[PDB]
């Protein structure tokens, strides 16, 4: 892009020959098991008109993939995290504004084709099967899709939701995955087994790593502030969320039918913060 | 290209050993939900005869993918954005001129072939089926095609229109996608379901990310101005648009037939701007 | 190549530790809708015996893809650009000479093979079907082929002609694409439709981007001049062309048969220019 | 990411123009055969508010893949390592905190498709076989999955567990791999052989290299400490583990049926360590 | 290679910290339409014992792809270039010697294996069909093969000959391509057409770009000379060739049979040159 | 990894702004035909607490692929090297310790999924053929697998053993490769031939290059030593091994049955060495 | 490797901040048509204990692919080069030793798995067809294999032998390629033709480029010498070889059967040389 306009590389960039102020803020949630890391770097480029503070939202959010409760030798349920979210918010009254953020929403690329279709040899003719022709396509489906919640001048949000999961190397089961005979098969182990329901749950290790241990954010954001602002201080609200579902399962005495509610429980490890732009330091 | 003429890399470039002026202008639309970011960098290279101001049109445009209205337990509609556009315009009287822009329109590459065709073994002969031979091809179709509206010395425009969308992992449905029995199936959930029409709409998360939250421009442009101009100031008109369609659906008591009008509503978050070339600053 | 002779990289290059003169010339065609950009960079390397001026032919040429005329509810035509050309010419009397140019004409790579052929099991024998064996191949066909018109010491020409186009994801139709029953199907929408012919044309957005808006040159050239020339000035003739065709269509009351003439109309946005080698500046 | 916000590369980084202190600590387990390497590098960047000590956990853990015992000409067993783990722990009372770690848990990418499905030619119709359509998919399964145990402010853990193994180039056998007739076939050599059971074990060289010799960690971690801490010293607990299983096998006089217990034995080469932050040295 | 011996990159190279002399020689053939470009760069490295002059043979050779003559409404011919050659020669008496040249002759890589062959189920047995097994292979065939004519201390030659060409996307026709019924089909348009033979020739644009306009050399060579030579001057003979064939065609009143002679005509734009090693300049 | 923690590249590295001592030790085995090369480089980084001497084990080990003996017109054998090994050892009493080594043992990656399996159309149902489903898989098998012998604080060992070999482009024969009718076919030429057995051996050139000439180590190791050690000297034991097998073959008057013993003969070109850490030199 | 031990790149290398002596030696064989180029670069690194002279064996060896003799209208032969070899030798008495060489012998990588095999549906059972299962495999076979002759402290040799060749795009014929009916088909043109045998030979241009013109070595070697040697001079013996075969062919009056002898003739362009290590110059 930059070099495509024949501009020398790095000419239209920022963060050079200046004294920046980085930092390190670490916080842990003893109850929800959520790790927090908001590594920052203040930018005060002279050529750049406004101030900057690139916010790197590191850390991790645990999974808590465990059997929360059992209700008999044939009935039991499991709670698993379904959507880790980070909706950072900035108070309206503050003049500070979000101006750039990564990741973002990118186009999804398909690859469609057509193999063979003709009216044979021995054989007005506007059959409806004209769409019933070669339809070869291809694309990929990551199990967790890092979406970007539609931001604004105040709130920048992300949502890493559950797309689908493969079980027993058979069927890309998703958040609904309903089979009338067997119910849902998201984390099943035996279809017609007679084992204990609490113990008849798919092993967390042989599944996606995100569910078992957790997920680690690596998202980034920059907030821009007027250089001539009287008060060089704002409020950063960091919010780590989790959406546990209720993947219940019961034995119909013939096969195991399971039902999963949507967003049964939520967690919110919100945390206030203060930015000392004058000191170019994010106070803990 | 440059090195292919044996020129040393970077010799025929601009933006070196000079003092450039960058900046930051952020604006948000409280009603249309449109974000605006026009990050700029003034260029005043001595070897280069004219002035420059590379305009980087960042920001985002929301999607507003929601059920706008319902008209009964069997009839309802949805409004979804179809074409985000950025048609920046510059007044005619101003001597400032656009000279380069990215992205542009690139050639589309196919890959055609032929598998097998012959007159068997046991078998003048100019059958019409000579085109009915091996026709294997391959290419890709992004769901949103970032077109470049044919620019001029004043107006440089872009249009990120909707190419197609895949639903239920079955059929690359597009802006027309008409099936006489079922109507349009762009965002359907159940074909023969009996659920509420307002609630019988495909979930925004399991679709393209652009529709749900929105789309973020990353387009760039440069306007060149005479170095000996008496008045070192022009007018930049930044325009963010959206084209919501009207994807209604109704139950024929047998199956759900939906119709989508074209360009039912539009939005235009136009914004005047002033460039202080003398100050090498884009005033807010 | 250079390093293959064990020469240090960049040793046999030009454009280093010297003062070059770049520039910017912008011009627009109010009638033909053609943009012009001849970004230049003068080279006066001391080690290099001759002078240089690398000419970068940027800009764009509009498409003007519109329904030029209609001749009844069943007969109508469309004019679409078929070959954008840039034939720069330099007057013969001038000693200035072209010496290098990019792009050029490159070899086309096929990939041929053979799957299976044998005289079975139960089965002198020099059948003509010895060529009727495994014939698997593969290669790519870009829709617009940037050819290099055979240059000389005076004229360097390019021609970006139309190779083929895919319609309805069915058939790589080309500049002739004749089917006796249906005529030409380059930009058809309905084969047996009853809609208005002027409105029965394939949408420009769902086709190649070049036809709808236009095409943007990025070609480059260098002209070399004697360093001891008495008159340090020549004449650059920049020429942007377009070849609109006449893709008419008519309804045979059974199906739509269309005919496309070849090179029905042309445009030539020729422009004289003057090079001030003494000033190392391209005067507008 | 960094350059996507147009920041100059390396601007938002640490570890520059400062005097760091590296080191080398080597320790070996004469009994368990575990190698230990905790290569370290102290960081005291002035711009960075806190202290750092990036911990590189090199070394190796042997496999001890040998026939531990035999119980007759037809019955014998083998002990093989199933899960190498490194759960470094830091005492709670110490203010030192973990802030970043690599590797982490990444999304798993599938690639799903659909080949062909239609209601033929000669042939309401809501068959249950609508999911019985083209389901072409592909992905990769590494035999050892480097998982990241859900960390916290004190404990950062890893677990390189056994995913699956291919035997005789036939069947991706895993940790359960139960066939009722033949039992488990993880490390079998002959299915209906009459050879000695202790000698009827798959050769360690023609299997995964990890089991035979061992596995070498290359994991990394950084602990951050308050710069104004009164006591500049903490306690690093490095722990190398192993989980030997009991892959026994017996001859049923017709075929060899083997059973593998889960986590029969474990090893823990825990090692206390002391960090002299004042000296910027990790004492052995 | 160099770094594989642990040598620092660039240590065993030439052309550093020295004053080289480049240049520019341009010449055009007003009759044969051949462009000549012998861009040069003198090398006088002190560490290197001998002198150098790396010769870069740029320029182009036209195609002259036109209907040379017609001999009736059914008989006509076409002349097309078949082998562009550059055989640079240096006089024997001169002590100057060629020492390195690019391109060179490289190995051709195949990729072969077997799919399936077995003696079925129901079925000494040394059938001759043991070679009639899986023969899947793959490789590529460029249409023009840049061969390196076997050089010597005096003559360094190249030959870019015609390998094959694809017509009508059907059959990789080559320099012989004989079919008894239809003759040769190298540049045919209609097999059983009744159109004028002079006009019944494949369009040059829809074929390889080399034939229509021409081909551009980019070959390189270096000649090494004794540093203590009394006479610091030699003679460079640059030779650009072309081999037009005679692709005639005639109508047998049933189908068009064409014959192509081999090397019917040739062209030789030889050019003497003088090297002033003392001046480190290639005089025109 | 390093940059993933946002550390500047090269910050956590060693071997900079210091004076290192390299060297060159060459030795050849006149009898076993083993070449020895232990290229070294002493490291004395001030920031690094300990000393270093990176040991690069270059050289080669011959193959000696020849017909060692013949025992009649129908019986003969061949000796071929099966496992080149380099087990460097360091005496226990010496405080010097191995701390890092490359290559190491890496995970093996498969690629598995399913094509198609269903219960047809016209057709409780827990058939054992549920594993008999789409089992498409693929991976690579190098013929010589560079394993890493499980090291310790004293001995670091490698073993490049024979995985498999392809003969006659038919069958990936391995170290056992037993066919009851034909015996082993590792290096056979004719299955039912009548030629001399000593001459009926597969040509060494049309096989793997390692067997014919030999194999060249490129392995590396580093030993770390206490900086405050009283005696700055240890003993490096370099050992190059070879494991010739006995691939005999005999004619059963119908077909050639061959047998290959395991590890029939071995060679050990052990060599003592002395490191003068004080001189920073490896004495020959 | 180097950076894998966390060593800074280039730390354990040679050839830096020192004055090296390159050179240029050119020689041509007027009879055998062999070019000779032994480009050299002396290395005298102070840190490195020994001396160095990296030998780059450039040049070329002609092919002489011509019809050597004809013996009747039906019988004729062709001589073609089969194995270009470079066996450089150094006299035993000289202390100079070879220590590193490129290219070397590398492992060959296959890619094998199974597609489908099962005992059907309607169908102890240890059939011999258990090896008759999915055997999909793939790998590459270059036509000329650059082998490394097993070197020693004195002689370093290479051998670029003929692997196979494809004729008529049908069959990868090799050095034996015997078919009883047609004989050898290495360079045949017509199988049942009646043309002159001397003229019935495959055209050299439509075959591998190596045979027609020749092959160009690019091999490299380094010889190391004691720095304290009394006599700083040795003897380099450069040897370029060729192995012409005798590919005769005769007409059996039904088909053309050809026989090719092995190594019928050889050539040896040996050349003595002298190294002046004191002068750091390779005298011609």
From Swiss-Prot, chains A, B, C, D, E, F, G:
Protein name: Alpha-hemolysin
Result of altering residue 135 to L/P/R: Decreased hemolysis, wild-type oligomerization and target cell binding
Gene3D superfamilies: Leukocidin/porin MspA
A Pfam family that the UniProt record links to this protein: Leukocidin
Keyword Flavoprotein applies: no
Family: Belongs to the aerolysin family.
Organism domain of life: Bacteria
Subunit composition and interactions: Self-assembles to first form a non-lytic oligomeric intermediate, and then, a mushroom-shaped homoheptamer structure of 100 Angstroms in length and up to 100 Angstroms in diameter. Interacts with human ADAM10; this interaction is required for toxin pore formation, disruption of focal adhesions, and hly-mediated cytotoxicity.
Gene that encodes the chain: hly
Mutagenesis or variant effect for residue 48 to L: 7% of normal hemolytic activity, reduced toxicity in mice
NCBIfam families xrefs: hlyII
Biological process per Gene Ontology, one example term: cytolysis in another organism
Entries under InterPro entries matching the protein: Aerolysin/haemolysin_CS (IPR005831), Bi-component_toxin_staph (IPR003963), Leukocidin/Hemolysin_toxin (IPR016183), Leukocidin/porin_MspA_sf (IPR036435)
Species, as recorded: Staphylococcus aureus
One Gene Ontology term of the molecular function aspect: toxin activity
Record's comment describing the protein's domains: The mushroom-shaped heptamer is composed of a cap domain (comprising 7 beta sandwiches and the amino latches of each protomer), 7 rim regions whose protruding strands may interact with the membrane bilayer, and the stem domain (52 Angstroms in length, 26 Angstroms in diameter) which forms the transmembrane pore.
Primary role: Alpha-toxin binds to the membrane of eukaryotic cells (particularly red blood cells, RBC) forming pores, resulting in hemolysis, with the release of low-molecular weight molecules leading to eventual osmotic RBC lysis. Human RBCs bind much less alpha-toxin than do rabbit RBCs. Heptamer oligomerization and pore formation is required for lytic activity.
Entry's Gene Ontology cellular component terms: extracellular region
Places the protein is found: Secreted
Keyword Signal: yes
SUPFAM superfamilies xref list: Leukocidin-like
Keywords, ordered alphabetically: Cytolysis, Hemolysis, Secreted, Signal, Toxin, Virulence
């Amino acid at each position: 892009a930059d070099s495509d306009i024949n501009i020398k590389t790095g000419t239209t960039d920022i963060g050079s020959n200046t004294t920046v102020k980085t930092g390190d803020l670490v916080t842990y949630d003893k109850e929800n098991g959520m790790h927090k890391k908001v590594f920052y770097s203040f930018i005060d480029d002279k050529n750049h008109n406004k101030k900057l503070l690139v916010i790197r939202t590191k850390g991790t959010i645990a999974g808590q993939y465990r059997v929360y409760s059992e209700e008999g030798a044939n009935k039991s349920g499991l709670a698993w995290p379904s959507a880790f979210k980070v909706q950072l918010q900035l108070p309206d009254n503050e003049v500070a504004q979000i101006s750039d953020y990564y990741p973002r929403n990118s186009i999804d690329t398909k690859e469609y084709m057509s193999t063979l279709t003709y009216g044979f040899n021995g054989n007005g003719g506007l059959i409806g099967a004209n769409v019933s022709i070669g339809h070869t396509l291809k694309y990929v489906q990551p199990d967790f899709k890092t979406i970007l919640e539609s931001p604004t001048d105040k709130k920048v949000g992300w949502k890493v939701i559950f797309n689908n999961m493969v079980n027993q190397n058979w069927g890309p089961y998703d958040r609904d995955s309903w089979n009338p005979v067997y119910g849902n098969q998201l984390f099943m182990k035996t279809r017609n087994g007679s084992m204990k329901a609490a113990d008849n749950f798919l092993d967390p290790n042989k599944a996606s790593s995100l569910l078992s241990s957790g997920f680690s954010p690596d998202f980034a954001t920059v907030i821009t502030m007027d250089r001539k602002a009287s008060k060089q201080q704002t409020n950063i609200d960091v919010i780590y969320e989790r959406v546990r579902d209720d993947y219940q399962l019961h034995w119909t005495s013939t096969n195991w039918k399971g039902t999963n509610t949507k967003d049964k429980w939520t967690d919110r490890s919100s945390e206030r913060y203060k930015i000392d732009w004058e000191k170019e330091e994010m106070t803990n």
